[PDB]
Amino acid sequence: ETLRVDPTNDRLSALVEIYRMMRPGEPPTREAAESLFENLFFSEDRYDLS
Amino acid sequence: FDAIKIALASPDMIRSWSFGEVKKPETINYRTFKPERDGLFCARIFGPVKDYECLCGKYKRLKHRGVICEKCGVEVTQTKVRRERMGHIELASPTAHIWFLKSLPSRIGLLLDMPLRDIERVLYFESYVVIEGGMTNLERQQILTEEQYLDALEEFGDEFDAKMGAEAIQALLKSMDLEQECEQLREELNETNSETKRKKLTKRIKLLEAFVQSGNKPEWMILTVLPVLPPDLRPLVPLDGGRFATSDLNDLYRRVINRNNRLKRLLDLAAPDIIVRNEKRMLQEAVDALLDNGRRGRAITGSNKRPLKSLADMIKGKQGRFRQNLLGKRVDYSGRSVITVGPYLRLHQCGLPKKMALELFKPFIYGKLELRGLATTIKAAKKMVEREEAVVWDILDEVIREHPVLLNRAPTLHRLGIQAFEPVLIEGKAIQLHPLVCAAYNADFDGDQMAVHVPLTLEAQLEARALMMSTNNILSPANGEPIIVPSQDVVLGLYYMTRDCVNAKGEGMVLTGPKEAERLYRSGLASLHARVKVRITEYEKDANGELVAKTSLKDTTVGRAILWMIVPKGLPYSIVNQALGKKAISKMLNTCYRILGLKPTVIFADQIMYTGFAYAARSGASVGIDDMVIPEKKHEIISEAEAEVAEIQEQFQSGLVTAGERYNKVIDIWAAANDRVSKAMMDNLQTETVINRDGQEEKQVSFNSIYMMADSGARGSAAQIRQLAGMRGLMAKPDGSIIETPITANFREGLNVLQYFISTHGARKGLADTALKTANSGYLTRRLVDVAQDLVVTEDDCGTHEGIMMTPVIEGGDVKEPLRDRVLGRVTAEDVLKPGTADILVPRNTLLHEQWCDLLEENSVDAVKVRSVVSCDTDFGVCAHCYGRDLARGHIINKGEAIGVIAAQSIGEPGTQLTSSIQVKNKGSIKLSNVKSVVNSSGKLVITSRNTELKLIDEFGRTKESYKVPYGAVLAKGDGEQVAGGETVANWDPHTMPVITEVSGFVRFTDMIDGQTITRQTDELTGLSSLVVLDSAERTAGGKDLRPALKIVDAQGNDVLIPGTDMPAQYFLPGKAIVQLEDGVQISSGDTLARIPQGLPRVADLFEARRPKEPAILAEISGIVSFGKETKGKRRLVITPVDGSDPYEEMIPKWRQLNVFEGERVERGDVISDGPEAPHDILRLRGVHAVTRYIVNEVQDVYRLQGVKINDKHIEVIVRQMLRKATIVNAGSSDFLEGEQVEYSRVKIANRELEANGKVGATYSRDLLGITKASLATESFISAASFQETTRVLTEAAVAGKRDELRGLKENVIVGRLIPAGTGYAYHQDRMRRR
Amino acid sequence: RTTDPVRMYMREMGTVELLTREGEIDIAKRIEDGINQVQCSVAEYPEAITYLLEQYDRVEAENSIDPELAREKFAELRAQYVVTRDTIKAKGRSHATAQEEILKLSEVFKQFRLVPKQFDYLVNSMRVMMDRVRTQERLIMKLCVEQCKMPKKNFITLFTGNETSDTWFNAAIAMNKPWSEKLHDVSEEVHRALQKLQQIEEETGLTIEQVKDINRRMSIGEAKARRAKKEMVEANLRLVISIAKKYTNRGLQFLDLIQEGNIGLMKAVDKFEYRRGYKFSTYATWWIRQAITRSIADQARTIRIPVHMIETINKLNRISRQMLQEMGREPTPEELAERMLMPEDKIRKVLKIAKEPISMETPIGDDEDSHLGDFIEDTTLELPLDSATTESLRAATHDVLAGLTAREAKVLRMRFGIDMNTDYTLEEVGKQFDVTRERIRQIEAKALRKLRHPSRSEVLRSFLD
Ligand SMILES: [Mg+2]
Ligand SMILES: [Zn+2]
Ligand SMILES: [Zn+2]
């Protein structure tokens, strides 16, 4: 039921589908959306549990 | 001035307002504390800094009053010009007013039929709009992108004209139309026939007719020039720490003028379109953050990382200008101080510190020192005050007498949380409060910071002395019972005074009266407890105020006679001879106020407090460990409870029941053990083995130290004593359940660390309840005080000739309150009479006081006609003889008494303390209503109707017992039979609602196919089954095409009818219709076929009346109610009357319990869905006299369930103000489908349909709005702009031109004049007549 | 589709495409073409000769070139003008060799010595001449299209012909024209405007069509220069958003610094002068940093401290941070004063004016119930003294000086301003009564000797406190 309503399927569009939910109004590129996903989920400078 | 007129700001109006324009972002100089030329604080634009002192120091000291200094433009005048000088920032580009852009509703799209997404597309510089085009493709109000703008540029060229941003929508609003669009929308509103379009086009055309009628323009809605706030109101003042004290609004105005200067530098420098469009977008965002910071985007920060205050954050909630600086304001002559006990004072007398009265009464001290000649000047008297001369204490004692002062608890709970007092001079630094009125404060001595406010002038001084002194009101405004009753300590002393003994060491001595009683108590030879005979002189005014003298011997005690020494002449001894509890002393004070009046009652209360203090000093009422006795059979009850829970655990282990039944059984046996130990401690507490005069053993009321606080109700009910001495009953789990292991031990034995944890669970839950829901009740008081802000007694009596039929609640159980205290103080509408149709003894317009309530109590009255405020015909208030009696005075209510804020303080009073086998309990005759009954073949009477309500009327003629019976019951008794209590008279299964048929005939299965519509399934329980049907969710579309129905007719092929009507005998087949009868058998009338199965947030939801969790819809018109389209889950509902609205349909969401079947007979306004009822349909079908009666029977019983009685008028005038705005149904006077107030609807009936001509169209329909909704629908705007959503309702007032006449009571509070209520009502009688 | 203006500003930045090095020098060459189009089109203007003549008169009293080249190279266009003026005006205006001499005058113009104040004057004079001929055409359109019942299409075909003499006026009174027969009712403005057009044409010495296409070339070159400036500033918004990271303090928002760097880059466009061979980012960095420091000096502070004191207090903050890093202790003003080579009182004076004043909505208490503003003392104080004595002393003087039964009270009430508007000296009260000053002084001393005794003015004596 998640896969019946998915907005985008591709990895790029998908990642972007996020950029619009996080930082709306700015149309991103591939590398910009990838860097935003990395520094928002999988970066030690913005995420630490220790 | 006498009226407040609001409109939209024109740029020429701002240019006239300006008297100086600002163009530079400088505020002041940084070295010298002087603003230079043309700045945000400048002297040319706004005015000078000091009083008559120019900028450079050239013209000062009153020499140049109106000239302008040519060096810097300063006008040498006072500092008062700095609070009224305006702005006029020269904006290079027009900008968007965010109050008219991002509001809810936005009011710029509803003027244009444009969605807010497209408004965000055009105002943010992303998309273009075209005002007019040469072709029909580029029509008006079209939303074009930049690529579409380029395509229209290469396609059209100079034919079209499409700009972007605030200037484009400004020209669009300016050059659309003025009245032709209004006429076209007016004709196209009623040209089309729809409902979704006629709920927004009527609001658009009402907005447009307000624009044309108020003289406003849509060009003035948008902002082309921004005026700044006056600089004294945003003061950049040097604080005493070295740094400066600025406002954040100064920073926002500096940023707005900086972006304006950047725009002005961008226009002449030939900027490209991207930078100037971003500059206009940033100017729009800056003025948006200046007006309302939390609408257009992220809140703008400062240096301290905080959201800065905008012009909307300056007026919003409790932190706004209204509720912090305008409505609730700090005041001079207000002394914060704690409360102490003055027991040696009168009821109108309080204490006052000599230091606080010395500093607080300083103008009175200086005036009395100058008028007596003891002081020469003001500062010599000030030095006499600062050095504490001996004579200033004497002059303070002279000025403090005959000078009342207002004591005030912060925050107040009700109206009696602040009243005046005549202070005396004592030492100390605190206020000695009189102990009798601390219950009216509900302010126990916990160090409560009481403010003491000084009335200055003789108007306010006599208003303090004669109206709001504590000697003026012995009753409460919430109920007729006195809340200034003797409180806990003095009622304990009085209960120790009125107590009797069996030993009674002053036995045998006959007392001459009160004199000898107090003599032999004070001499020590006789005790306070002696059942002897006392000759007491008593008086009663049986004639017109004439007291009669009589003296006889009564079986009483000595202390009752010593209290009778303090009791005045007019009281009887029937109230003094009992045990004299707190409710008995409340009844004593009530009867004293009814008989003697206010003149002896205050002196009686003062003498009662003095005697209670003097005989609680000599009482020695001291709680101890041996006084709080343990019951002797306490350990065996806990041992039997342990054996019972061991039996329950063994029945849970060896499988017979589940864990939920185990929890229910352990809760039941622990409640039984709690009741057993409560009766054990009650039997050990209320009985005490005392010796008689001879050698005997006789029990009596005990002299225990806690039974005086338990039986009399001094401080604590029976549950507190039952949990203190006996074990604790039940606690509160955080999920809402009850702990299965209650506290076995009590407080004297000690609580274990586990048991203290189970206790503190429910204790911290109740404390969080007291922390949250009492503040929620305070905001509910804030809500309810702003919907009844115009109810003042204007006239004395209007010719309405209509009222309510009042009845007490006997809902479910027995009776709770009588009719005497229910219609206490109310005024009758018609000439009510006895239950027999004779001897009319009550006039048309009279109150219900003494010689009227007992005159009905001696009769067997059950329902009387009472005049209300919901039927009062006059506007902007009600009449005196239509409301009844003012509850704190006890006579005819004066013209000016504001009833609505009385009701708000009354409903806000208990907000801090809120936190089947039908067996009759009396004897009477069986009576029903809407009767459809028949005798079956067993000797009983079944019910084949839904709206039957079983009520019991005895031989006297009163409705002592009543019930609510659903459809499908069997009565064991007949109509008019004298029954006895205890026995069950209504027998029906509570788990199912049957389909009992009154057709006595054969059984025929018709119009059903086994397999498509119905199925074949035999019941394996009893073996009695037939062709039955399952639920509607499992069947196929055979029931969706052919309607399944049971036509109970004869077996010979012919058809029968219903006895009484002409409808053929055909019952319908809903879901879960598993019938238990075969065909061909002769069933009788009354046989069963099938089995079909079935608080303060609640107070706030019932006051708002918005929608419950499950709405209970009702039937509209009496007739045949059937189904429309068949059940696709939630399909439809249709209503077909015989002489009513035939094609009108309805909608049923949940098909759980249908009261009436699809095709049977209903009554208009009959219940359809079960559950909580939404009052919108109840007002839409039943009148106001039914909805108001339902509310004063529901929420008053809810308040009574907590243990506090409120008069029903206070939960009646708020309901009257809840339907203030009504919905008109026909055009001709104001509009077709507008929401108009009841005053504007009453002024239209009295103008057209009274003396001018016939009916031009004035019928309407009332609507109960929400409390948050009715506060935004007031005809006055300045009181509506103070409750909540001041942005929204202030924009609605600005775009409509709502000129306030200041008719309501808070509307003169906000403007700062005399209110049109109370003493100011007679001033407004001359104000509104001379205008 | 969003709510933040800076994110859609980034969207508008991402709509346009950036530049490489060859794209940078191509946009610089487009800027050069947009400048040189106006530079060669102004050579055909007759007022440029008088502009260069007044420039030669300005430099007569005067890397850089020698002034002898400025004296020599600013006088040949005068010779070309005085050998063209007998052909462009005299002996007919429509002539081929006259246009050849016009092109000869235009091809000797490249002696620029460009000054930004000099460039504005010719553009302003030609723009107000274009505005004059445009409002001339606008008033002609107002008298001919709206009036006399003829549309706009019946105007341009006779307007483009000559627009010099009276033939176009009676050309609009053509073969029948019954709706346009009102000759003298419309002549009164149009021949008065035609005489103004004729004196404009004799001022410029050229027909109106040639200066019309010259001004059209001015508009075309200005539009091309504006589009080149637009793509130059749009390709370098990454420069301002990458330089705005080092000044992201809590004094201003991001967008104000971005749009100040925008006008700094717009100034750097005309201050670039790309013929040296540098990049636009390197030279634009200094101008955008100057605009950023100007915005952080003028704005970001309630009390507007100027840019030089902002620079000295920024240097003082940097020196204080350096002494914090070198010492660890708090920086005393003595070490900052000796390292700043300034006196210590100036250091404490610029330290006093440290930062923005505490706003009015800071939670100085424990909760959000009482913000600031409920603690400020009143500057316009109204004490019991200042409210009571300021009227009771007035009543006391009105009671005591009423006992003065002669003109001494009447000349003393205006001596200080009691119950009067303007305070007067002895001379102004003299001209009303007693023009010799010492008479008023002696009666004032007599009233002083009457009032200073503690016998009846003791109520006036008690007011000294
Ligand atoms: Mg308290
Ligand atoms: Zn000045
Ligand atoms: Zn009335």
Swiss-Prot record, chain A:
Co-administration of salinamide and rifampicin or salinamide and myxopyronin suppresses the emergence of resistance to both antibiotics. Acetylated on several lysine residues in the presence of glucose. It comes from the Bacteria. Belongs to the RNA polymerase beta chain family. The RNAP catalytic core consists of 2 alpha, 1 beta, 1 beta' and 1 omega subunit. When a sigma factor is associated with the core the holoenzyme is formed, which can initiate transcription. The rRNA transcription and antitermination complex (rrnTAC) consists of RNAP, NusA, NusB, NusE (rpsJ), NusG, SubB, ribosomal protein S4, DNA and precursor rRNA; S4 is more flexible than other subunits. In pull-down experiments interacts with CedA. (Microbial infection) Interacts (via flap domain) with Escherichia phage lambda antitermination protein Q; this interaction renders bacterial RNAP resistant to transcription pausing and allows it to read through termination signals. DNA-dependent RNA polymerase (RNAP) catalyzes the transcription of DNA into RNA using the four ribonucleoside triphosphates as substrates. This is DNA-directed RNA polymerase subunit beta. It comes from Escherichia coli (strain K12). The chain holds residues 349 to 398 of 1342 of the full protein.
UniProtKB/Swiss-Prot annotation, chain B:
Binds 1 Mg(2+) ion per subunit. Zn(2+) 1 binds at residues 54, 56, 69, 72. Changing residue 742 to S/T: Resistant to antibiotics salinamide A and B. Changing residue 764 to C: Resistant to antibiotics salinamide A and B. Pfam families: RNA_pol_Rpb1_1, RNA_pol_Rpb1_2, RNA_pol_Rpb1_3, RNA_pol_Rpb1_4, RNA_pol_Rpb1_5. DNA-dependent RNA polymerase (RNAP) catalyzes the transcription of DNA into RNA using the four ribonucleoside triphosphates as substrates. Resistance to the antibiotics salinamide A, salinamide B, rifampicin, streptolydigin, CBR703, myxopyronin, and lipiarmycin can result from mutations in this protein. Belongs to the RNA polymerase beta' chain family. This is DNA-directed RNA polymerase subunit beta'. It comes from Escherichia coli (strain K12). The lineage of its organism: Bacteria, Pseudomonadati, Pseudomonadota, Gammaproteobacteria, Enterobacterales. The gene is rpoC.
Swiss-Prot record, chain C:
Signal peptide: none annotated. It is found in: Cytoplasm. A motif (Interaction with polymerase core subunit RpoC) lies at residues 256-259. It comes from Escherichia coli (strain K12). Interacts transiently with the RNA polymerase catalytic core formed by RpoA, RpoB, RpoC and RpoZ (2 alpha, 1 beta, 1 beta' and 1 omega subunit) to form the RNA polymerase holoenzyme that can initiate transcription. Identified in a complex containing RpoD, the RNA polymerase subunits RpoA, RpoB and RpoZ, CRP and DNA. Interacts with Rsd; this prevents interaction with the RNA polymerase catalytic core and with promoter DNA, and as a consequence, promotes transcription from promoters that require alternative sigma factors. GO terms for molecular function: DNA binding; sigma factor activity. Residues 426-445 bind DNA. The chain holds residues 93 to 612 of 613 of the full protein. Residues 400-453 are annotated as: Sigma-70 factor domain-4. The record marks 415 as: Interaction with anti-sigma factors. Changing residue 449 to D/E: 2-fold reduction in activation of class II Crp-dependent promoters. The gene is rpoD. Sigma factors are initiation factors that promote the attachment of RNA polymerase to specific initiation sites and are then released. This sigma factor is the primary sigma factor during exponential growth. Preferentially transcribes genes associated with fast growth, such as ribosomal operons, other protein-synthesis related genes, rRNA- and tRNA-encoding genes and prfB. Keywords: Cytoplasm, DNA-binding, Sigma factor, Transcription, Transcription regulation. Its main location: cytoplasm. Residues 232-302 are annotated as: Sigma-70 factor domain-2. This is RNA polymerase sigma factor RpoD. Belongs to the sigma-70 factor family. RpoD/SigA subfamily.
